[PDB]
Amino acid sequence: MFEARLVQGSILKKVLEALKDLINEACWDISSSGVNLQSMDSSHVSLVQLTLRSEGFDTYRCDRNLAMGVNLTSMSKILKCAGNEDIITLRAEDNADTLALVFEAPNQEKVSDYEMKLMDLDVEQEYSCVVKMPSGEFARISRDLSHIGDAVVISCAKDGVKFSASGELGNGNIKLSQTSNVEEAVTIEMNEPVQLTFALRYLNFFTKATPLSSTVTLSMSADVPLVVEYKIADMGHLKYYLAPKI
């Protein structure tokens, strides 16, 4: 029997809000280490890696490893049924055919309990630049550049980070410079200059995880796909991997 109880239950809601638009069905790895997910998107161009460590949960028990095939949209709806301040418990048997979601109330007078059905889905350091910026600012830049073109050139040097886009109506570039504050500051760790090109649609998909964290981390290098990382509040992390265009 697997049982995970988490007081801050909004975290799950936010995670699936970030994921429902990217992956339709996915296999959750349930272990003594926590809740994990590794998957491609429906268009097979990007990679999503979600980690929620067991220590971050209020109660955690995982007798056997579980490979829960889940339709992320259905689970997102069911989590929509939960209140933002509810306590969320995920429960499964060793033969995980049903998943149980328990939503607890303030004065223990409302107790929602939903049961999903799981499917038989088999589960399947080089970096020159690291930018830490506000998650809202990254989402804003992605949304803004979406109007200009389909591909974004991210340039990273010791002077700042630039997001450029070109398309039918013209071009456009945004320049973020490091600040003096140093979750509202922009910080650049550049060990080698970097100039790469990525699909803006997938970046806008990644930015759906903005409510999970106030800061986003863009880890960039010429030979590896970009990593967009959102750190949760003292729990796991959501990492998106997107290959640079040739």
Numbering used by the authors: 1 to 124, 131 to 188, 192 to 255
Task: Show passages lifted from the paper.
pmcProliferating cell nuclear antigen (PCNA) is a sliding clamp protein that acts as a molecular “hub” for chromosomal DNA replication, repair, and maintenance. Each subunit contains one partner binding region that various factors use to interact with PCNA, allowing the trimeric ring to accommodate up to three partners simultaneously. Beyond its role in enzymatic processivity, PCNA functions as a scaffold that congregates various factors that copy, surveil, and repair DNA; thus, PCNA coordinates DNA replication with DNA repair, chromatin remodeling, cell cycle regulation, and apoptosis.
We found that overall the structure of PCNA-C148S is similar to that of PCNA-WT with an RMSD value of 0.85 Å, indicating no significant global changes to the structure. Furthermore, the conformation of residues surrounding C148S does not differ significantly from PCNA-WT. Although the S228I variant has a deformed partner binding cleft, this region is not obviously altered in PCNA-C148S. It is important to note that a portion of the binding cleft exhibits weak density in our PCNA-C148S structure. Despite this issue, there is unambiguous density for Y133, a residue that dictates the conformation of the partner binding cleft. Because Y133 is in the same conformation as seen in PCNA-WT, we conclude that the partner binding cleft is unchanged in PCNA-C148S. From a structural point, the C148 residue is buried in a hydrophobic pocket near the interface between subunits and participates in a π-sulfur interaction with F144. These types of interactions have been shown to confer substantial protein stability. We found that all three PCNA variants display unfolding curves consistent with a two-state unfolding mechanism. Both PCNA-C148S and -S228I have dramatically reduced thermal stability compared with PCNA-WT (PCNA-WT Tm: 52.0 ± 0.03 °C, PCNA-C148S Tm: 42.0 ± 0.06 °C, and PCNA-S228I Tm: 44.0 ± 0.1 °C). Our combined structural and affinity binding studies indicate that, in contrast to PCNA-S228I, PCNA-C148S does not exhibit the defect in partner binding that was thought to drive PARD.
